[PDB]
Write a protein that binds this ligand. Structure first.
Ligand SMILES: Nc1ncnc2c1[nH]c(=O)n2[C@H]1C[C@H](O)[C@@H](COP(=O)(O)OP(=O)(O)O)O1
Ligand SMILES: Nc1ncnc2c1[nH]c(=O)n2[C@H]1C[C@H](O)[C@@H](COP(=O)(O)OP(=O)(O)O)O1
Ligand SMILES: [Mn+2]
Ligand SMILES: [Mn+2]
Ligand SMILES: [Mn+2]
Ligand SMILES: [Mn+2]
Ligand SMILES: [Mn+2]
Lengths: 196, 195
């Protein structure tokens, strides 16, 4: 049969992340357990946050994917990721994506498409996001000189990479800089390559 | 310029632990962060692997082999690339082929392998190797794939046309409540965005 959540007991709770004990029934009817992770910041939204796939489009250039580089404490190092952020209450994933993109990179984009809620690491947490594809007219004078404005302690570096050579360019950065590329970013790059 | 200063254990379970991370920001200011780690870490190249299995048969569309299973943290079923932990002394490529065979019964060949990539850098230190594996669906070996599941592992196999992956993923989501993995969806998106 199907599997069902029986109960969810809180183990420990921080200000942002909480650890839980999940009791559930497997197909055979046997009671199993699991140690699940959940954020405390989510309330009544469609997902925790969004990830933005910013496609920089310019008349004189190949399409580029705008990525960001920042220090991630949980990783204890710098990571290369799609721009990403939380969805504000009453805010749509699309609106969150456009704002987040501008805040982190300074680019002003347009919605190309928006995904349903997708899971970040189902074996670990309940964390989900909306993947929002956003196009940026790099030729518009407004996007000629992108000027971001991070919040308090963000410190974000912007890195644009050619769509037609994304994977190789990511590999280079990993070897030279000792960075860690995001799994979504790399999955994206792999498909671009496999499609040719 | 930024680095880790210290880490204080907040709560450790048998599988997962939560801790407070103090680090130095670019200004020289001290800040903290709540980070998640699996209670099992070592001198590996990554925590585990995720396999992108490309089922190839002559005169047929390529298919992407995915797995569907109940995920307690999500409290529901998810669609993911086959995945699992890497064993001691085992290469990422080796764990991929083994993991794929265990979950799908398919015996494939290594196409390429990524460096260690982060699963959710804003939350945890979890990393994996994304391994692209081609499966000769015409070879006798792969005529009748026999999955060899471990205890407590209940995995359903799904093969979707690579040429129409995104749309087929949506069709599944439309049929019933389930969540597509972000890595799988990112892959499906790029297939459409390509040139
Ligand atoms: N009770 C538990 N609580 C939390 N994590 C657990 C767990 N039991 C358990 O195995 N894990 C870990 C093990 C894995 O890191 C992960 C399960 O996801 P995967 O990698 O697809 O599983 P795999 O195929 O079995 O190796 O959760
Ligand atoms: N001290 C802390 N510990 C843990 N998580 C934290 C945190 N402070 C904090 O903001 N978070 C959460 C908030 C978010 O879930 C995430 C911050 O990173 P992102 O995804 O890029 O979000 P953004 O900064 O809003 O754009 O971690
Ligand atoms: Mn951010
Ligand atoms: Mn934000
Ligand atoms: Mn941000
Ligand atoms: Mn698995
Ligand atoms: Mn497994």
């Amino acid at each position: 049969g199907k599997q069902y959540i029986i109960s969810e007991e809180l183990i420990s709770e921080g200000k942002w992340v909480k650890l839980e004990k999940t009791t559930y029934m497997d197909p055979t009817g046997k009671t199993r357990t699991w140690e699940s992770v959940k954020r405390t910041t989510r309330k009544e939204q469609t997902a925790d946050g969004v990830a933005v796939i910013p496609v920089l489009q310019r008349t004189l250039h190949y399409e580029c994917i705008v990525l960001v580089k920042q220090f991630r404490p949980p990783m204890g190092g710098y990571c290369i990721e799609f721009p990403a952020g939380l969805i504000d209450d009453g805010e749509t994933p699309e609106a969150a994506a456009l704002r987040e993109l501008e805040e982190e990179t300074g680019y002003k984009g347009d919605i190309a498409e928006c995904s349903p809620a997708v899971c970040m690491d189902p074996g670990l947490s309940n964390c989900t996001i909306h993947i929002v594809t956003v196009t940026i007219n790099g030729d518009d004078a407004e996007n000629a000189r992108p000027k971001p404005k991070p919040g308090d302690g963000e410190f974000v570096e912007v890195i644009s990479l050619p769509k037609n050579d994304l994977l190789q360019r990511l590999d280079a950065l990993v070897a030279e800089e000792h960075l860690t590329v995001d799994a979504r970013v790399y999955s994206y790059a792999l498909a671009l390559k496999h499609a040719n």
